[PDB]
Structure 1
């Protein structure tokens, strides 16, 4: 089964990685529902920086021969969605 799990204060770096957000925290989740298996759809909660330092959503994809590159410490909140499982090992 493809179970959705969320872990924060820890991030795992895959391969294909971009960064897109503007507003509406929940809304950017659907950015990977366009056709995006989104193997990791993760967030990085911020605001205490420069007035308005709002959401920047983290999207990366790996589980091939390249497993994960671990980022320790100040990670936001990374969640596994659903369709990633079927794309897990392409």
Structure 2
């Protein structure tokens, strides 16, 4: 029970943040379809590197229930999909 959950205008930064260099910032989403151990996939309606950045994507996970530090305004879409959401609390 997660499927497509994407919040807009806001992005919650959890723990391990990595900037993935993928082909087509949209297609980067597939990282969670092959590897079910991710959480927040961030990307703007244009580009995905936090605000700009074409061949990139903004990815981080919450393994511990740490306080979700949220950046605001200059963002776009942030969501989690598939069953890997359950990794949040193992």
Q: Is the CA contact (8 Å cut-off) linking 1:12 and 1:69 kept in structure 2? A: yes
- Flag the 1:70–1:31 CA change in 2: closer, same or farther, 3 A: same
1:25 aligned to 2:28? no
Q: Which runs of 4+ in 1 moved over 6 A?
A: 47-52
Retained in 2: the 8 A contact 1:46–1:55? no
Aligned-pair distance for 1:78? 0.4
Deviations 1:23-57 (A, max 9, x none): 32331111232323321111134469999952421
Which consecutive residues of structure 1, in runs of 5 or more, have no partner in the other structure?
none
**Distance in structure 1 (CA, Å) of the matches to 2:11 and 2:24:** 22
For structure 2, the residue ranges without an aligned partner over 5 or more in a row are: none
Choose between structure 1 and 2: higher strand proportion.
2
Greater helix share, structure number: 2
Give the 3 Å change call, closer, same or farther, for CA 6–20 of structure 1 in structure 2.
same
Q: Name the Cα RMSD after superposition.
A: 3.7
User: 1:44 maps to which residue?
Assistant: 44
Give the TM-score taking structure 1 as reference length: 0.74
